[model samples]
Target: KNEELRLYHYLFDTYDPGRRPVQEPEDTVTISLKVTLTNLISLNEKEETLTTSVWIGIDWQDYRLNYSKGDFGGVETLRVPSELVWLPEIVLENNIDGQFGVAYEANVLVSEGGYLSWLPPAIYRSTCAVEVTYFPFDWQNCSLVFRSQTYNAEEVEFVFAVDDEGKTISKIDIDTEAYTENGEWAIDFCPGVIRRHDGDSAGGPGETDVIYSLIIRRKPLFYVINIIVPCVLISGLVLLAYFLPAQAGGQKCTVSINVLLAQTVFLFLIAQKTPETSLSVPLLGRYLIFVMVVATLIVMNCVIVLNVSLRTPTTHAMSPRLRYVLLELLPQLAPEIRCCVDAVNFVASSTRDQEATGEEVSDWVRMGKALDSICFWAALVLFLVGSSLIFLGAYFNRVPQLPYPPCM
Candidate 1:
């Protein structure tokens, strides 16, 4: 359609769209529309709103304003301003800002026998009940429900047409021209349907509606960059606590708890970014929680390891079996995989801290080094397995599914 026609001469209002110029209110006005989504501006789950720009194509015929083709040189199509003819007052019930469209006088094709067609596009930020249970790894189901405000079902009925040959039955045609895809969200799929409200006039079934829904999912790469990747790297730093010699009273615990504090700050930041709901936690949230739990345990273990390594014969006595496991059996089992410090370095740190008969003071310090080796290996193993499980489990589950039977 060309935008060359500036028809101010046809600006005189021949009929009012707000006031139906028909004779009977009971007479059915059959209507059809084609919708095009130009831009999905933003979807705020916290506010439960969907902001989008769309082009709507309306088709209907009014018999009262009919004219024969023989009147004006056999011209069937007439380009007139929308103010000159009657229009259906369509409204969205769930609209938050209460914005509506088509005040500007545009070119409307008025054909023979009063066939009226026009494409009116506008930006609508409408309210919808969006579920943020899954969060960054979540999908949402929201709809655009269109209903006539001025006319009842007895006066107006609606439907969406498709190709009869079953070739391509597209109800809502998305306009690809200059359409800007969302950066953080992506449209999964969409389907259109007409709901007929059939009942006695002025009693029940007050309105017939045409509902179109857009299924969208969050793009998780943003969160992975800001939240997830950083979290995993921070979690890896906790393992470093195990390698540090625990002869000093507070060094090991401080390193671990500091890492814990960093993750706590990240948790606070993540809470601000995501919706406040307990429906279902996201993978990022779950991973963050797991890291926090491990960090808390790391803190506890570091305290225990610090106290044990500093023990004297009078304070704590070591058993023969305990000494056998720490000094002999465990050392032989993981000799190659021990922490960066060998047994000689692990023993040297204990000699300077506790002054007692040789083997008596060395037992607990020996046990402490064994525990550190376990910490390093155990934390390393679980981090790989758990991170893989949490991310991969969600990755395989990201495919889109149909809501029900699709629109035809």
Candidate 2:
């Protein structure tokens, strides 16, 4: 009986510690943590580097009882592997005393236990700092990625915070950074994915790619309003000189010449503003040329009108019908409207000299004035119709299909 009692006491001592009076009971405690990203570095196609910042949070729990203290001195120091850690496999070592250095290691066997664990493949050992912090904590990940990785949708949401200021800044910069022939460089959120040239040669675990595009939205408006509109208006002004009366003294010539000079200056300004490339004319150049040509025609018309108005009556009266028809008819068909006034004057003056009485002289003068009035009205109508046709043609041809750099 004594031996049996001693054996029972030894077994009890092995399983349980020295007995104590029951009192307050210990309960299980829960822990959590949060992780955040603070900064990152990226590499461009040309090997250029760029930096970005982000934030994150994480939560977890530990179920070990009376685990407040560890051999590493604290409970907050934990080792978190990079995304690349998923590959090549890892083995964690824990010392026998759980104090410092690796005590043993074992290969990890994946199972559905829903437990967090890491161990070495063999008996090899390593050491890790103990962590004592609670869950639901925030932290930053600051590391340079030589080549940036495409961010997943979930990752983008976590990194980007939405607020009034953020929305405004994003809206303003979105178009500014978008791809354009001439624009500033910035990040592109919508990068089209295509087949990789090297078949994923550059992509390792945790590696991603990002693209930067250029922004070009606001500059073309100035070109349209300042350059295009002014050139068109100046071209129209050149056509106005044709409506002035032939007998308006030097006014016809003055207007036409002044217009020609103005158009020339406009041409010079356009040349200065635009880049000179090929023989194909720019829209503004075409406008300037048209204006210049019409103005020059007006100058020629002025000279002919002056000549006809100043001719002597006797000389004009001697001209034959054939001479009038040939000079006036042929020139009227030419590009420039010239010589027609002189021929008309020759015919009128010749008829006037043939008059023998006061009634005949009065009749001839009235006829001449009537002819002048008809010519003035006809010229005005022609000028208006011609200008309308030219302007409408130019606008229809150019407004919808503006030229760009590649065409030039």
Candidate 3:
């Protein structure tokens, strides 16, 4: 404690906080920055913002505060209040909230040779443009940029910090030793870079900034279990309405509407979470809409099935072309029940065509039975093709396969 007091008296006597730490005002100060990621709080897809907690290290040499350890009771390091020293005033450039700098004004650690280090804890909310192309199974690239708006590139040079062995740290330092993994997102790449920008069109001084980009992939296990499995099985449920009793057309319509209602719920759930991106729909959304259309068509087809089943000879006469399609074309196509279809065709031909007898009410009923079988087969084919096609679209559009960083 006594040595720290002695070092403080020696360093603070007539120290000018406003003065640049450099010996000459024109000489630039090189500041090396290191960031240690603590936690990724949450990313709001609808709001397009990412919240994170991190520890920021700003290291620089201050020539003005240099002191020999022997002269200050052999004190090697002293922790001093940050307000008593000069600060680089680094600000988060792409922050979504109005807040700029660190969340806390922590103490500065000073070594014998004016090597000043400030480690501040910050919780930042930054803008991240949410790309919903594949969503649920998507990856996002977000960045946190820090810059000294008060100083230009000529006045302050920003660089990545070096490690204890003097190796440069080119990427964000994740706490692999003690990390709390995010449930929804997993980190992929997080490289840190220093960028220089020639000042804007106004001819202002050029600036140097440190940018840290985070590429995180959505851990789709949650969505797959909570949303996709139910969605896929329910969509397949549309086909179930087809195999129901041919006499129960009303129940078939009921089941079709129920599947449509379930799809609407899944769509609403996704829309509530995702942003309003107009350019492309989410893969899940595309699948849901496609199934909904299929369901709607099934509902219309069911109405036709019901109308055909109830018709009698008094109400409608079966066209021979329709008879050919129902008896010959359709039966030939359905090889699974070819023998039964042939038997039904023979009974119709012997009673109606062979005798040139006027059509009976039962013939109309037979026509309805044949039409029901065709609709069922047709609905099954449509559901299978549409579901597979939508998922294949997602499979092709998925993000490139990349290895997860070892920092996890």
lDDT of each prediction vs. the true structure? Answer: 0.72, 0.36, 0.83
Please say which candidate is ahead in TM-score: 1 or 2: 1
Model 1, 29-66: lDDT tens per residue?
A: 77776677888898876677898888777788876456
Better of 2 and 3 by lDDT: 3
Residue range 1-408, candidate 3, lDDT tens digits: 787887788789879887678877789999999999989999998788999999999999998789898887778888998999988989999999889988899999999888999999999999999888787778888999999869888788898988799989888897777467898888878878899988886677788899888988888888889998989899888877756654643487889898899889989998898898787888888888888998899888877776776675555766788777766855475785998999999998787764433445456656766777777788888878877887776566544554534445
lDDT (Cα, 0-100) at 79 in candidate 2: 31
Best by lDDT: 3
| lDDT of candidate model 2 versus the reference | 0.36
> Using Cα atoms with residue i matched to residue i, what is each candidate's TM-score against the true structure?
0.80, 0.35, 0.88
Cα deviation in Å at residue 61, candidate 2? 28
Compared to the true structure, candidate 3 yields what TM-score? 0.88
Predict model 1's lDDT versus the native. 0.72
Worst 10 residues of 1 by lDDT: 1-10
Ranking by TM-score: 3, 1, 2
Candidate numbers sorted by lDDT from highest down: 3, 1, 2
Better of 1 and 3 by lDDT: 3
